Each structure stands twice: as C-alpha cells, then as structure tokens.
Ligand binder design. Sequence first.
Ligand SMILES: Cc1cc2nc3c(=O)[nH]c(=O)nc-3n(C[C@H](O)[C@H](O)[C@H](O)COP(=O)(O)OP(=O)(O)OC[C@H]3O[C@@H](n4cnc5c(N)ncnc54)[C@H](O)[C@@H]3O)c2cc1C
Ligand SMILES: Cc1cc2nc3c(=O)[nH]c(=O)nc-3n(C[C@H](O)[C@H](O)[C@H](O)COP(=O)(O)OP(=O)(O)OC[C@H]3O[C@@H](n4cnc5c(N)ncnc54)[C@H](O)[C@@H]3O)c2cc1C
Ligand SMILES: Cc1ncc(C[n+]2csc(CCOP(=O)(O)OP(=O)(O)O)c2C)c(N)n1
Ligand SMILES: Cc1ncc(C[n+]2csc(CCOP(=O)(O)OP(=O)(O)O)c2C)c(N)n1
Ligand SMILES: O=P([O-])(O)O
Ligand SMILES: O=P([O-])(O)O
Ligand SMILES: O=P([O-])(O)O
Ligand SMILES: [K+]
Ligand SMILES: [K+]
Ligand SMILES: [Mg+2]
Ligand SMILES: [Mg+2]
Lengths: 541, 550
Amino acid sequence: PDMDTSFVGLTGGQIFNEMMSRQNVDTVFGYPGGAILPVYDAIHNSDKFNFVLPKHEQGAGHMAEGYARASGKPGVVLVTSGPGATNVVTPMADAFADGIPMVVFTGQVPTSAIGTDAFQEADVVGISRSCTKWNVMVKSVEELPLRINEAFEIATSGRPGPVLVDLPKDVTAAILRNPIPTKTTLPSAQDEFVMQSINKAADLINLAKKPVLYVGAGILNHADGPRLLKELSDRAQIPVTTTLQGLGSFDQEDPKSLDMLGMHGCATANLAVQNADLIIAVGARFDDRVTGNISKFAPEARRAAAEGRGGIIHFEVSPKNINKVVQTQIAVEGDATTNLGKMMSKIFPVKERSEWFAQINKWKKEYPYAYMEETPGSKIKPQTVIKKLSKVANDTGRHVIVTTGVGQHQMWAAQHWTWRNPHTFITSGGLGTMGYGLPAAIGAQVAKPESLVIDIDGDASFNMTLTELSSAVQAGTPVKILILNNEESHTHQLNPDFIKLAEAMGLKGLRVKKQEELDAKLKEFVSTKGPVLLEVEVDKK
Amino acid sequence: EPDMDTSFVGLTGGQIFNEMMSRQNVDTVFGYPGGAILPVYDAIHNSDKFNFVLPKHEQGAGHMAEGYARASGKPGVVLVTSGPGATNVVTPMADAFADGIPMVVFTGQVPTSAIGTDAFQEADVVGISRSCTKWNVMVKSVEELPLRINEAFEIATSGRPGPVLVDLPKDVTAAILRNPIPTKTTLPSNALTSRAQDEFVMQSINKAADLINLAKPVLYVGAGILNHADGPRLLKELSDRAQIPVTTTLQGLGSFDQEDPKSLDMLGMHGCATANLAVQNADLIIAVGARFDDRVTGNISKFAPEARRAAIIHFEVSPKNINKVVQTQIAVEGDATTNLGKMMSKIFPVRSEWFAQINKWKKEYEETPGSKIKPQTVIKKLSKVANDTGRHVIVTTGVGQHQMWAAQHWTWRNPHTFITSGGLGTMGYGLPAAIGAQVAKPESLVIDIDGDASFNMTLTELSSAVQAGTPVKILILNNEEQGMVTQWQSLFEHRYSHTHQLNPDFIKLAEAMGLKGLRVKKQEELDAKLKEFVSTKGPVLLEVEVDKKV
Ligand SMILES: Cc1cc2nc3c(=O)[nH]c(=O)nc-3n(C[C@H](O)[C@H](O)[C@H](O)COP(=O)(O)OP(=O)(O)OC[C@H]3O[C@@H](n4cnc5c(N)ncnc54)[C@H](O)[C@@H]3O)c2cc1C
Ligand SMILES: Cc1cc2nc3c(=O)[nH]c(=O)nc-3n(C[C@H](O)[C@H](O)[C@H](O)COP(=O)(O)OP(=O)(O)OC[C@H]3O[C@@H](n4cnc5c(N)ncnc54)[C@H](O)[C@@H]3O)c2cc1C
Ligand SMILES: Cc1ncc(C[n+]2csc(CCOP(=O)(O)OP(=O)(O)O)c2C)c(N)n1
Ligand SMILES: Cc1ncc(C[n+]2csc(CCOP(=O)(O)OP(=O)(O)O)c2C)c(N)n1
Ligand SMILES: O=P([O-])(O)O
Ligand SMILES: O=P([O-])(O)O
Ligand SMILES: O=P([O-])(O)O
Ligand SMILES: [K+]
Ligand SMILES: [K+]
Ligand SMILES: [Mg+2]
Ligand SMILES: [Mg+2]
C-alpha cells in the first residue's frame, strides 16, 4: 500500500485548508458556529482564501450558486450545525434542480453525541438526501481527505450538482496521527457504442436539409462548449436556438441565431423547430415549457425519423434523461462539449442553406416579437426598461452578467435582453427561488471582479433576501440592483422605501417615476462606482 | 346518518380546508402565496373567518407560527407553496421539533400525476421533513383531505407537542368532492381510560407520593409544565403544601413566579449558582416536565449527590425519554399537570433548615458613570420599566449572549411569557416570533430582546410587522465591536475574537421599513429612551450601543 505522511501532525482544519488548495478553491461562502469552528478558523485565518460572509446562511448558498455559474468552478459553502445546516436546504434544492456544482460542508456535533438529541444536532444527511447528488458524514480525520475529494468529483461530474459533507466537531479538531493511503489525498466497454453514436449522429447532420440546434445548460458545463457550438453552427450552417438556461451560449447578434425557444420564446425559433427535419439537442432536457404538447412537438422531425432521413439527436450526459421525454433516433452519451469535439472532423462543410435561412429570416420579420409599447405620458413598461438597460450596459463595453429574481420580470429579462456571452445569465429556473437575485449577483461579482453585474429583480422577490444588501457593501461587490416595482386573490404586500433602505444598508439609492427620467437614471445607475440600487416604478402586472 | 358525511359534497378542496380549519378552532394562519397552493390560499385569504398573516419570507411565517403557538397554547398553522416555499420552512420545523412546539405545516405540491417527474418546483418535502416532524403525509385525493387534517392536528397537539406536515397536491385541493365520506374522518380527533390504566398510573403516583413526604426536596420543573393551562397553578400548590424549592430550566422560565421566596430561579450551567448547588444539597430531585439536558448537567456522573442514595422522581410524558439520559428512581408517565392533581391529596402539608442552608448559599451570590453601557443593566432597567406599565409582557429573543442575559436578569412571573429558541438555537427567531406572539396576544406588550447578528438574519420581517399592525418593541443590543467567534480568552476573563459583520444603520432601517427608530449611545440617555421605547404606540426599534467587553 502506498502511504502518505505529509498530513501527519495537522488538525482536520488545516487538512481541510490544504484540501481546498488542492481543489483550486480560493473562495468560500459561509457563516460561523460552534460545531464548525475548527474548520472556520482555519479558512477564515488563511489569506489563501477569500471568505465571504452573508447575513443568513441561505445567502451563502445562493452566493455560491451565483459564483459557480459565473465562474465554472464549484461553489463552496461552510456552515455550522442545526440551523446553519437547515438554512442552506433551499439553496441545495435550488442547485440540485438547476444542476449547479456546489460543495456544502456542515459542522456537526461530536460523533460520540450523534443520536442523543444533542444541542443543534440535526440529521442533515437525512434532510438533504433528496436534494444532493450525494452526501456523507466524515467519521474520522483519516477519512477527511477522501471524502473531500469524492465530494468535489461528484459535484462536478455527470450533471453537476450539490453534495454535502457533514463534519463532526471532534473529527475536524483532531490531529492526524497515522499515515493515510496516498490515493485518498489526490483529486479525482461502451466506449465503442459511444463512438458509434458519434458517427451515426454525424451522418444524420450531414444528411439533413433543415436542421436546428436546440441548445441548453449542458453546453455551459465545459469551457470550450460555446466555442465548439459556434464552430459546428458555422461549418454546417445550422441555425441555433437556446433554452432559458442556455441563453448566452450563442451570440444572439449572430445571423444564424434563432434566440430563445419555447412558449415564451421567439415565434421564429418555435417555427424552425416545428419545420426542421433534424433537431440536434445539445445539453437540454426537453422541458414541457420548451416543447409544449410533446405529441405535437417537432412534427417534421418525426416525419423524417419515420422516413429514415432525420429525427432527434440528443447529446446527454445522464443516461436517465435519454429517451425520457421524447424518443430519440440517436443518443450520444456523455459530455456534450467532448463529444462535439470528437465529431467535428466528421461533419461535411456546407456552403449555404439559402432556402432554409430564407424561410427563417422571412419568419423573423414576419413575427417580430414585440410587446405593447408605451403611450406618451404614461406608466413605464418593464420590457422597455430592460431593452434600454441592455443598450446602456452594452455601451460600456464591459463584460456584463445578469441575475434575476423570480416572476414576470424573470421572463422579460430573458426575452428582451440581448444575450451574447456564455455564463452571463444567472437565474433560478429549475426551482424558481424568489430572493435569488441579490445574493447570486454578489457571488457572481466575487467570481468576476471586473464584470458589470446587474440584478434585474422584482419587488416581492427582492424582499425575501434584501438583508444581504449590507453583505454586498461589506464584500465590496459593486452590484447594480434593479427593482422593477409593480406594486400599486391579489395579495398586496407592503414594501419598504427601497431608496431609504439602500442608504440605510450603505449603498446609493435611485428611483424613477416618470418616463422622462428613465434614460438619465439608467446611465447613472450603470455608471455609479460601488453598489447601487435603482427602483423603477413600473406599470401594474 | 353518523355513517357517511355529505356536508362536503360539492365543495372544493380549498373550501373543505377552510371548513376544517374552523372545526379545529383555527382563526390565524401564517403563510405566503404560490401557484401550487393557490386553491387553498385563495380560500383562506378570501375568508374573513381567518386572519392571514403575510411575512416577507416563508421562514418568517414559520417562526411567527411558533411565537403564536407558545403565547396562545394553540397550534401554529403555516401555509406555503411547493419547492422553495416548502424548503424555506425547514428551519422553523426543525426548530419547533426540538422545542416541542405544536405546528401544522401545509405545503402546496405539484399534481399527483406529476409526482416523480422532476416537475417545476417539485420537491420530496415528505422526505426532506421526515426527521424534523412528528409525522407527515401527502394527501392523495380530496376525499382523504378531512382525515389527514384531523390526524395532523391530533398528532401535533398530543404527547410531546411538535410539528407535522401535510403535502397538498394542486389537483387534489382544486378538485370537487363528488362522493360522501365516513363521518369518522371528518370529526376532529379530540380528547376515557380503564381500571387497568387507572391502576398502573395511580400505582406509580403513590410510590412517588411516598418517597416525597418521607424526605427533606427540590422541584426541577421544565417546559412540560406549561403544556397544560392549569399546569403552573398546581405547581405552586405542590410547593406551598410541602414547602419545596422550585428551580426551572431555560424553557421553564415563567412557570413559577420568581418573587416567591422558594424560587431557586434558573438551573443549568448558565443558571443561578444557587440552584446548581440546591440540586446537589437535595435528597430528592422531582423532575417535572424536563429532559435533563447535558447543558443542565455537564457532569452527568457528578449530578445529584444527596439525591443519589435515599432515592429522583420524573414526571415525563414520553417514555422514550425516561431513563434515556439520566437514571430515575420513580417514573410517573403521562401529562405532568394531570398527574400532579392526582397526587395533591396524598401530600402532607407543612421545613426551616432547608431554606437557611440555601438563603446563605444564595445570599452569597455594575457600570460606572462615563463608561460603556452593560447589557445586564439594559435588561434589568427594561424589566422594571415594562413592569411599571402593569401590562402583560411577553419576551422573545435571538440567539447568543443576549439570550442568556435575558433569561438571567429579567424577572419572570407569568407563564407563556418567555419565547426563545433553546433546542435548536435559531438566530433570527426574535422578530418573527415576536410578531406571532403579538398576533396571539393583541393586548400584551411584546418585547424582542435581540442581538445585532441575530437580528440581521430576518430583519426583512420588519415591514411584515407594520403590515400586520403588530406593535412589537424590538430591542437590539448591538455589541458589534466584539467578534462573534472566539479565538482565545483569559482564565481569570477577557475575550479576543474575530469575524465582524457590517451592520446597517438600524434606525434608518426601521424608518425605511415604516417604524419608529431610537438609539442610545450613552448611559445618560438610557432611562429616557427605555421609557419612550416601551411607551411608543406602534412598532418601534431601539438600538443600544453596548460594551463589547462584557
Ligand atoms: C411560466 C414559465 C415559462 C417558461 N418558459 C420557457 C421558455 O419559453 N423557454 C425555455 O427554454 N424555458 C422556459 N422556462 C424554463 C423551463 O421550465 C426549464 O427550467 C429550462 O428551459 C430548462 O433548460 P435546460 O434544459 O437548458 O437546462 P436543464 O434543465 O439544467 O437541463 C440540462 C440538460 O442537459 C444535461 N447536461 C448537463 N451537463 C451536461 C454535459 N456536460 N453534457 C451533456 N448534457 C449535459 C442535463 O443532464 C439535462 O438533461 C419557463 C419556466 C416557467 C416557470
Ligand atoms: C449558549 C446556551 C446556554 C444554555 N444554558 C442553559 C442553562 O444554563 N440551563 C438550562 O436549563 N437550559 C440552557 N439552555 C437550553 C437547553 O439547551 C435546553 O433547550 C433546555 O434546558 C431544555 O429545557 P426543558 O427540558 O425544560 O424543555 P424541553 O427540552 O422542551 O424538554 C421538555 C421535556 O418535558 C417533556 N414534556 C413535554 N410536555 C409534557 C407534559 N405535558 N407532561 C409531562 N412531560 C412533558 C418532554 O417530552 C421533554 O422530555 C442553553 C442553550 C444555549 C444555546
Ligand atoms: C420562495 C418562494 N415563494 C413563493 C413563490 C411563488 N411565486 C412565484 S412568482 C411570485 C411573485 C413574484 O413577485 P415579484 O418578485 O414582485 O415579481 P413580478 O412577477 O411582479 O415581476 C411568487 C409569490 C416562489 N417562486 N418562491
Ligand atoms: C442560523 C444560525 N447560524 C449560526 C449560529 C451560530 N451562532 C450562535 S450564537 C452566534 C452569534 C450571535 O450574535 P448576536 O446575535 O449578535 O448575539 P450576541 O451573542 O452578540 O449577543 C452565532 C453566529 C446559529 N445559532 N444559528
Ligand atoms: O455557537 P453555537 O454554534 O454553539 O450556537
Ligand atoms: O407561481 P409559481 O409558484 O408557480 O412559480
Ligand atoms: O473580523 P475579521 O477577523 O474578519 O477581521
Ligand atoms: K433576446
Ligand atoms: K431572573
Ligand atoms: Mg412585482
Ligand atoms: Mg452581538
């Protein structure tokens, strides 16, 4: 057996510290507590890590999600036992539904006390079983490195997701006395069937006359995904449409872009999909919000399949989701980016699809998706605020990241903003957690310090977690908080004075009541150095 | 006909739910809207038969419900939507579970036909809340709705009270009851025994009643005694008769008037030193509605010397707790209060060497003008000011040093007046619990003695207080200068700590939320601000800059 002694003499806390470094972790979100003290002190006292403190553990969890989605790295959360652990359940469930990599470490009462109704003792492993890909309770310090490495491996492989590691106080406070297996300290057949599927899929794409790329979140789980997607779209001249969670993976300013697909997407995108002979699904799960009545989804693709000249190709990483909603002609199992890479050289270069694009461009100017404009001297419409802010943001030339709350403003943000860069739309889709906006924006800002981070929030959503406003100031994250306030069966909620709230929290507050002041405020909003909140009184829902 | 009930035929799940709440004597519901719970939400929200309290975050709803229950004696009813709505009430359920607080949580769920398909906002709530509820279930059909509701309330309020969860699929609550259902399933499972039951209990009651009289004793009373209306009343009678010293756990505070000369006050490590000794200088420890927390007896082995010989009576309700931590001599299973009445007769009226011994031990155990303000002084002065109003006063707190100071330096007199998170110790509990308590006792003066870090956890509920019209008095003992994490300290006792959270301007926050804000920086302004604080009509927040070296 290959043994290692480099950790002998250290405490669980220092080992934890060392393991984070080996995992390339430089940011940790969390809140202190007695049970997690040994680890907290180690991380909090090291200048090797940036410890971000929220005002509520839920904040830590959502901040970690924002961090992960904007960086591509797993979000690390550190909290204490009992209430500390239960306060991160929503964020774990949220991350679980959206497939976001997150590693949650929770302090626990001493192993000797487990199952005695000790103070702040909770069956966290049991509580988080359904909202984590995997969880475990470290039983001894020798086991610590192993569990950490497993946690990171699982959280970042297959469909990314959250994992939880329960850390008993006696275990993290103990000192490693014995050497441990070297393997456990270092990070991390059908191979033929998959290669066959890649060939078959290449054959279908080369064969297609009116193909469509239906792209989702999966393409963002690899740094080169968006690049290879563009390459494939250019090489075979294939129009590209994305899901809500796929926004940003393809430049919407590109001529081949169909924009968002679904009951809330562009008519043109929905048409291309209903008329296509081949649909190439890349990192998307065919949600009914996208497909509509499944039995009537992609009729021309079905016909092609029936006649042996098309159908549906699905690049999926999870075997469980293959053929789950729709029967597919071909399924390429595994990482979408990797497989698109292996398939590129097999794709026949297509000079043009004049007819297909003619029909598409015809629908574009035939169904110009536009909301109901605003009548002079009247309540400001939210879609307008978004279309405009998008322009103002764009004029700065900076990299822009957008987070949102949950509600009507969420869909408007998705629809009326012009997406161009990957990892720039961070919204809660799977679970739809109100209050996500602010903390996710803070975490995204910590991940991309130079980026302009905007949170397009709703008034009710914003109230859920507005206490994190002071956390933004403390963390030095200059997030731009936009609140589309449409508050005048019918649950009228009382809102605080958002501007006075902001000032009370330590930020600059701005308000807009009339159309004649919107443009100036939007510019000041985006131009302000430091965190700032802008409330725009908008027309009732 | 008592066989089938037809009164609900034709109604929707939502109206049935509405009717069931009435049969359960529910007039208050805390919750937040969402698509999955819409059918029920609309029914409750549109009825003037119920007061629907809206928080800004579901966690607020849960803690508000706990405060409501502890101050009223009734179960706290919570109504939330699926997914995030359900997961946001997990902490409050875990909190209520640890402190044995009756709470009925109703969560909207995706249609039964969609269960297990990863539908939008679908969560295995029954699985998530299994370890933090006494019982839970997912209603499968509208005919089953009345049954589950009655079971939920029965379980939440019997044995050791606790939280229960009822998962409500949208299609089920939106459906209309077409067929009749058995009357048994629609009648509340409210609350007779046999000679076999009466004898078994009476047996242990007498055996215990003997070991009592035949001894010279101490009452170790806890939260259990407050779970019966006439609980504390019989506690006094049993202390008067045989002249017995009464000591309470943190959760027992208020069960016995600390004015009476027989009060040993609070027990445990952060308790009055006198009590800890009296618990040793006692020949017989009469445990009443307590669970011997290790925080009450660290040296489990060195616990109760004089009582460890001539035979530790235990009036417990859950057999699963008897002889599961400490070792008892006699066990009087069942409701404490009830078993006390069933033992009042067998008690021989009356001790002088007992008091003298204590009074001495007790008689054996401030700030200078110009220096920092001490928390203890704030609490003692506030207790006095509160008392001078003559009103019924209820106190809630956050979690931390201020929690223990509130317990120690306040003078407890009335039952159901100290509402603090002891079992789970949930920071952020103060404000929402105070709002719920206020809704339960509209005429009571409700004070939340909070800490700055704890208060930040849930300060968004401030606007909820204004909206609900609850005139809660929020006291924030801000000691932000000392960190909330100790690195090291002094033996003989300074504290060096780290991790300081940046607090917002509490006064400007209050004003922004719609309340009156007050601040105290110097000792020379404390008394006036305390009086204004308590005298202000409407919700008000008072921040007192306190010494970080206390
Ligand atoms: C009222 C309402 C309206 C909505 N309208 C729309 C709409 O019009 N259009 C729209 O798009 N959405 C809409 N949504 C959102 C929608 O419900 C789904 O949440 C979302 O579209 C799912 O997107 P996704 O498939 O890209 O991501 P996910 O649900 O995260 O699924 C990603 C898929 O990719 C797979 N995957 C992950 N990583 C990899 C990898 N490395 N390699 C290969 N595969 C991988 C996953 O296993 C999974 O199958 C709406 C929601 C609501 C509440
Ligand atoms: C920093 C800190 C310091 C603390 N210091 C102290 C301290 O010094 N002293 C202290 O006491 N606590 C202290 N606590 C609180 C402590 O952790 C426990 O939560 C508390 O002592 C439990 O009190 P209890 O047993 O009275 O109530 P519970 O924990 O609620 O237990 C009640 C018991 O009574 C039973 N019961 C319930 N209803 C009935 C009924 N109707 N009839 C009969 N039996 C019934 C229950 O089943 C249970 O066994 C502290 C907490 C913190 C965070
Ligand atoms: C934690 C949580 N509670 C409840 C819901 C149900 N819900 C979905 S959208 C919505 C209202 C959103 O209001 P607001 O944030 O103001 O946005 P708007 O739709 O007005 O833009 C609610 C209550 C939810 N998604 N999450
Ligand atoms: C939700 C939650 N997170 C963390 C803890 C750990 N914790 C216990 S006391 C405390 C600090 C309390 O600070 P404050 O509220 O300001 O009170 P003080 O002790 O200063 O009076 C913390 C962080 C907890 N009990 N609950
Ligand atoms: O300080 P805690 O984590 O023991 O409450
Ligand atoms: O309104 P929701 O709960 O369906 O998002
Ligand atoms: O309080 P500190 O340790 O974060 O500076
Ligand atoms: K767009
Ligand atoms: K006292
Ligand atoms: Mg709104
Ligand atoms: Mg404090």
